[PDB]
Symmetry: C2
Subunit: 386 residues, 2 copies
């Protein structure tokens, strides 16, 4: 517990909605990001100008959303004096934003800052060398992530039934968690418009994660067509749903949090990023997690919760088995198969879901957030709850 | 700052300092019509990544991370950058990400690798910047116009040049004088060989309009135009505004280029026997009004100096980016910098400004000049940033 430690003060997120057909299908990402930035500042009552920097994870906007994010800041009436940037490490971008704010604090650039992630996959739309095909690993960076799911399932022998069992459990856990109110602290309601019959915007308020489908049955999952490959085992049912969402997290040097009387929700203890074959990008967490634990000084047995991103059941299941994780410790409130996976948001989202569960349990504990990353990487972060 | 032992330029040399081991850049070419007009940015970035590793003979898999600054590619060029890594045969086990803080992205890449080292994530990494302005807004809310500062983020940077020229009273003559000096300094520096160490030749193809493909090798910055005269600059039409003072001549030229920088924890550099070209001492990022974004360095520099524990007098060279002569001139006068210390080899009006690259490029240009001089010294790299920011970094060159 050093004065120099980077602590997580507080975080909020939007509900996660299905892309194209859900409540945020007509809502621009700057609006999603503004709602969560605004909520985090208000919740801890931090003067906006106390922010040393804002870092936004984002994957699909031009330039990784730098203009869009800056516009959001101003939509939140956060003053121009507070700077902003964006980061893209694909599916990890949201957690990357956390690591980059942590890094700025440790560089002496500022004492406090905000790490966000956002993605509008509803509003989604490099210039690459002509000799791509001379270089197999360059070529492999264009493999659709859904095909890498199938590659992982075949190389490492993860059956359809394994995948579906995994997905039904993620759905079922998510349903109970939602009913018990586990997501109510973290979600901020967002009021927006959705377009109608005759062109008129009509108002709605989104308070709940749309992809949690308690009607999921094992019979129904087994019936689904493959989503990417003729004789494949990856389906819409055992994959993350394409989604819209935002999340914002306030981080501070411990001594600054104390100076200002801000709560400490968690402490960042380690962050590990490793590279794997893009081909089978899903194996990332299997290699990121051990390095993160080593750096934080821990073993698998010391961790209470692992939030491992469920891009696809194939890769998530493989990682749990390879690492010999106690299954009851993995995504106890469900993961992305149920919650959705708005690319740039998910990493920050996980941190909030993780720490709010550790908080409820109220015991000093360690938790991991980890995900696979397109183009062949894994990231993992270790956090300590007080 | 206020402790018993403080002395403004006292040496500090911890095992934890983040040091710059080495750096290389492409020559910078004019967008659309230059040598890199047909070269994709992955190729530009590959050439510099390859060069830096080879130059210091680092095993590529020793890299803990690669961070690439980029502004105009989709997703800030993450797919592109990763492809470039593999074009350099840097193995998959080395991870990569991209960053966008607009014009500062290349320096931001340096700060982000520095930060990863400070986080305990790795001991050594590569900070890069790249931009193909030859080849390259988003989904924004419907109520932009309800929020003036949001609206202001869509003001063309060329119009913010005019805004700064009018708000702060910087004449056309002031601007042209500045641009002639930048060109003249750049021509001499090129003739003396100042850029020879840092530039890595790139061999690429250009498509001729006869439908013919031809191999060429670019070894020199295309924008350095010794034929610039005062008379010629005074005759140019305004580039953005009817009665304006900003022109193609007193602005940075739209450009293509990449730069790569290897950074390490000092103790790791020493374990591996790697050279130390410089040491990163501070990094400051501040916000200013987007409509006069050019003033950024005037507010970023003082903060960076305070953090590094320095005053303007302690600095030997300021590399201040010359996006526009208006903005650059304002910043030199506001800060009362000795002019001989600002961009001694010329800046972007002459060298060009490939958005994501520049910040990295500046670092390399700065450190190579301090190295030539061979004295222990401090240097500053700073730039204004679209949508209303400034960044500044302090670097220490060892020696004497």
């Amino acid at each position: 517990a050093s004065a120099a430690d980077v602590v997580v003060v507080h975080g909020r997120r939007t509900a996660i909605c299905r892309a194209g057909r859900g409540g945020f299908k007509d809502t621009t990402p700057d609006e999603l990001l503004s709602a969560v930035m605004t909520a985090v500042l208000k919740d801890v009552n931090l003067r906006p100008e106390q922010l040393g920097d804002i870092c936004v994870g984002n994957v699909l906007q031009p330039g990784a959303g730098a203009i869009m994010a800056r516009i959001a800041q101003f939509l939140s009436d956060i003053p121009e004096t507070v700077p902003l940037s964006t980061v893209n490490r694909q599916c990890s971008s949201g957690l990357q934003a956390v690591a980059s704010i942590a890094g700025g604090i440790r560089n002496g650039s500022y004492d406090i800052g905000m790490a966000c992630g956002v993605e509008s996959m509803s509003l989604a739309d490099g210039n690459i060398t002509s000799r791509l095909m001379e270089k197999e690993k360059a070529r492999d960076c264009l493999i659709p992530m859904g095909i890498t799911s199938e590659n992982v399932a075949e190389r490492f022998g993860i059956s359809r039934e394994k995948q579906d069992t995994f997905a039904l459990a993620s759905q079922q856990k998510a349903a109970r968690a939602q009913s018990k109110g586990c997501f109510q602290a973290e979600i901020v309601p967002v009021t927006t418009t959705v377009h109608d019959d005759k062109g008129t915007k009509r108002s709605i308020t989104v308070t709940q994660d749309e992809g949690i489908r308690p009607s999921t049955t094992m019979e129904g999952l087994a019936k689904l067509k493959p989503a990417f490959k003729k004789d494949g085992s990856t389906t819409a049912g055992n994959s993350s749903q394409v989604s819209d969402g935002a999340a914002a997290i306030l981080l501070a040097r411990r001594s600054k949090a104390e100076e200002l009387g801000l709560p400490i929700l968690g402490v960042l203890r380690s962050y590990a990023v490793v590279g794997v074959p893009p081909d089978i990008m899903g194996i990332g967490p299997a290699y990121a997690i051990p390095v993160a634990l080593q750096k934080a000084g821990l073993t698998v047995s010391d961790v209470d919760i692992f939030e491992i991103n469920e891009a696809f059941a194939s890769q998530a299941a493989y990682c749990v088995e390879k690492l010999r994780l106690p299954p009851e410790k993995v995504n106890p409130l469900g993961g992305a198969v149920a919650l959705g996976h708005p690319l740039g948001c998910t990493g920050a989202r996980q941190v909030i879901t993780l720490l709010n569960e550790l908080k409820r349990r109220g015991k000093r504990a360690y938790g991991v957030v980890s995900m696979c990353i397109g183009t062949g990487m894994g990231a993992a972060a270790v956090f300590e709850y007080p």
